[PDB]
Amino acid sequence: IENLRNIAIIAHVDHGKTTLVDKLLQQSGTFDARAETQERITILAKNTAIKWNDYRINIVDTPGHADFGGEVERVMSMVDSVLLVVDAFDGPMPQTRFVTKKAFAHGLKPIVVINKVDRPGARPDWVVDQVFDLFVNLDATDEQLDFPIIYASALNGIAGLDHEDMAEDMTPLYQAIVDHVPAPDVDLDGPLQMQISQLDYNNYVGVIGIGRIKRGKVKPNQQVTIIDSEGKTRNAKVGKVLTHLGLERIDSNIAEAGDIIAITGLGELNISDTICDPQNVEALPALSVDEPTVSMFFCVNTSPFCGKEGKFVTSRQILDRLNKELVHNVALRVEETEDADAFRVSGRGELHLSVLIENMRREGFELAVSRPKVIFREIDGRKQEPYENVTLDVEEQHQGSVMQALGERKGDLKNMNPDGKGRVRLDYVIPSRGLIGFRSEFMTMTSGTGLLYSTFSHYDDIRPGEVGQRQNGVLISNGQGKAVAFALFGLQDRGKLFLGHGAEVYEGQIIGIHSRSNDLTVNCLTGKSGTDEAVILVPPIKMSLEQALEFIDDDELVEVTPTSIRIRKRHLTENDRRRAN
Ligand code: NA
Ligand code: NA
């Protein structure tokens, strides 16, 4: 127990945290199940367990996805310190600030590694000053400002407290971890209490629960009572108890409090479930969950062009592909609707849904999707919507316009923190519904220089007024067939077009953006003293999947194939659109 060290690791993508975890594992003589010697997946295991002398160090990877601040909090709630790894030349970079801020907010003391100290142009002393300023900028406590520094060269396999007189090996980094990281604070003799912090899956056993055992012990085939954060309970039987050794999970006959473990055979475990000894059912506090706040309908493509471009089109081919994603994509949610050729798919931001669709197009799928929107849930008698905690890290020159746009998106400002080094951090509380479409506008407005983070917060009363109302109406084909130059030449005078001469269109397909706010049903199949000389079309607007989804309204769909992106009305005929209004 007193010999366990549970630490999380933080590093910019190119600052060699994988290289460092590898050197620490090799020099510790921990049995290595893989087969790499010296290089010259390059990402970490979610947990790496190092055996050094009579000490066990669990290194938990810090999630790098910007919309999963929930998961970052769960990592910090499970560990007792953080290892911040920083390059000897770049110094700390703004990409790791969000996760560093979470570590300090959960009251963790940091251990700083300045690695690549022998690379050309290294300036470790300057990196120390940069790290000190960051922590002060993060409102560090006096205990958080009193932190060890270990200089390191994974290349030469050496570490030290002093970069000018480095030791023969990595001994100093290990010693810094056991000296300054407290052992887990846990009750070994009380009844089993273990919270699910992370979920994983493999075809050999199914759902895998990952967590730090808060109290007691757990064995294979043990009878447990699982309790969720809604207080509902269910009895179950532990299948396998898996301990961590290097990059691998080990079938173990027991596991004790303080230890970070994988558990199986407990069916559909959810984040924050507490596995309990059946006599003493005690739920631990609810953990932040990465709630799927944006939803789209994934429908069978019913267009007159259906089946002509992709191999996979049926309702079961699509459902089979979705359930197949669901097991490997634990944040995602697939639901059946009253329509059997329509499936409500929910995920962490529209990007999560758009990536899935792009995967299915490449595979040969064909489908229609509705716009990304939130699910309005009735809780405590009223209609509430999801709200998010949002962090924006921007160059100071972008502060003005970023704030105006977030205000317009119903964003409540909560904090402004400039670093005095050309960047500012803005914390907002905004309904998820006001965040849809923003990441794209945010990149354009900040010229790709900004960083945006998201952590699900809560449901609350609906904030009044619609967000991102499209101002322009659309041009809708009233026929099926080949679009012609002479007719497109006349319509491009009334709006911008999505296609040119020779495109096959169908009735209700959207073929352009109208200059005015109203929709027009137009003819693009036949052509209507002086005249207009030359029939030349301005190049069509060819939208990405992301643009089609941010373009479409509630009465429209994006028809998707492996080779094509089409926009369409739900009601393909003008008569049908009139009978809805
Ligand atoms: Na739960
Ligand atoms: Na969201």
Side-chain angles (χ1 to χ4, degrees), residues 13-81:
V13 167
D14 294 338
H15 285 199
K17 67 168 163 193
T18 294
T19 315
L20 183 64
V21 172
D22 267 20
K23 265 284 162 186
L24 283 182
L25 177 72
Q26 162 211 90
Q27 287 206 7
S28 74
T30 304
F31 178 50
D32 214 3
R34 299 162 311 148
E36 282 267 36
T37 288
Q38 293 176 330
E39 199 189 343
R40 207 274 203 76
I41 206 314
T42 54
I43 67 169
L44 285 180
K46 290 180 170 168
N47 185 237
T48 314
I50 299 166
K51 276 166 163 147
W52 186 70
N53 304 317
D54 287 311
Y55 296 93
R56 296 178 180 173
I57 296 159
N58 279 305
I59 299 166
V60 191
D61 194 28
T62 297
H65 196 312
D67 292 322
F68 289 77
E71 195 176 334
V72 178
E73 266 158 24
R74 261 134 51 196
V75 166
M76 304 308 172
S77 283
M78 210 167 52
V79 289
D80 308 304
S81 278

Side-chain angles (χ1 to χ4, degrees), residues 241-486:
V241 174
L242 298 147
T243 312
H244 293 94
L245 181 79
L247 278 67
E248 302 305 298
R249 282 157 184 163
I250 299 293
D251 203 1
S252 185
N253 43 44
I254 197 182
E256 283 152 70
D259 193 27
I260 291 166
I261 64 150
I263 190 167
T264 72
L266 290 174
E268 304 295 358
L269 292 170
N270 284 291
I271 308 299
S272 79
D273 283 348
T274 305
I275 307 166
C276 284
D277 169 79
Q279 265 61 237
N280 299 122
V281 177
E282 190 193 312
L284 289 164
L287 301 169
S288 316
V289 314
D290 311 282
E291 189 79 341
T293 49
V294 52
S295 78
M296 299 161 57
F297 285 105
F298 279 53
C299 315
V300 173
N301 174 20
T302 59
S303 80
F305 286 2
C306 66
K308 295 198 189 286
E309 297 188 18
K311 300 176 171 57
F312 311 122
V313 308
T314 72
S315 176
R316 179 61 73 185
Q317 282 173 344
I318 290 166
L319 180 57
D320 277 354
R321 182 57 181 75
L322 285 183
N323 294 332
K324 200 162 296 195
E325 187 69 37
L326 207 53
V327 311
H328 297 129
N329 186 357
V330 313
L332 187 66
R333 175 154 303 152
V334 181
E335 300 173 351
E336 324 286 326
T337 81
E338 284 200 331
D339 180 16
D341 288 16
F343 312 105
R344 198 197 257 168
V345 192
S346 296
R348 195 75 196 125
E350 53 268 26
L351 60 93
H352 188 199
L353 299 182
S354 77
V355 161
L356 169 66
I357 298 164
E358 263 298 340
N359 283 341
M360 296 176 67
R361 287 178 79 208
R362 288 174 177 173
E363 284 161 17
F365 273 89
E366 222 176 291
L367 58 72
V369 290
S370 53
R371 58 172 201 93
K373 66 177 77 171
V374 294
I375 318 86
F376 284 175
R377 298 216 159 269
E378 185 152 4
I379 187 168
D380 281 33
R382 290 231 199 299
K383 282 281 216 154
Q384 284 182 62
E385 53 176 331
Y387 286 68
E388 308 275 350
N389 291 308
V390 168
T391 291
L392 293 86
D393 184 342
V394 297
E395 293 177 351
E396 268 179 352
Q397 55 156 331
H398 292 129
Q399 173 172 316
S401 60
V402 164
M403 288 178 85
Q404 181 166 1
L406 268 180
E408 284 184 14
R409 279 173 175 271
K410 304 306 182 224
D412 297 334
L413 174 60
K414 296 295 137 158
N415 196 83
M416 181 180 323
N417 181 341
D419 59 4
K421 300 188 181 191
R423 300 194 73 90
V424 62
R425 281 85 190 183
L426 301 162
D427 293 324
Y428 278 88
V429 174
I430 184 170
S432 325
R433 160 173 65 82
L435 220 41
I436 284 161
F438 181 60
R439 189 179 277 277
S440 184
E441 169 185 344
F442 175 73
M443 287 306 113
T444 285
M445 196 189 306
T446 67
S447 287
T449 67
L451 296 169
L452 170 65
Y453 299 91
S454 190
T455 305
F456 164 77
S457 178
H458 61 266
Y459 286 78
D460 201 341
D461 282 335
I462 288 186
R463 189 180 173 83
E466 295 306 298
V467 54
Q469 275 316 142
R470 185 183 79 190
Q471 297 289 279
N472 293 84
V474 285
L475 305 176
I476 314 152
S477 177
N478 69 357
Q480 179 172 343
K482 184 186 61 58
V484 310
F486 192 58

Side-chain angles (χ1 to χ4, degrees), residues 187-193 215-217:
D187 177 12
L188 183 75
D189 294 337
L192 176 52
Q193 199 191 28
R215 151 183 87 201
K217 300 198 276 279

Side-chain angles (χ1 to χ4, degrees), residues 112-115 117-118 124 148-154 157-174 176:
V112 173
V113 173
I114 302 156
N115 67 347
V117 294
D118 303 313
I149 296 165
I150 299 90
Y151 301 99
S153 183
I158 51 165
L161 298 156
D162 186 347
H163 61 270
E164 293 296 321
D165 177 36
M166 299 280 285
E168 280 176 355
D169 64 11
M170 297 298 302
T171 298
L173 185 45
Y174 300 111

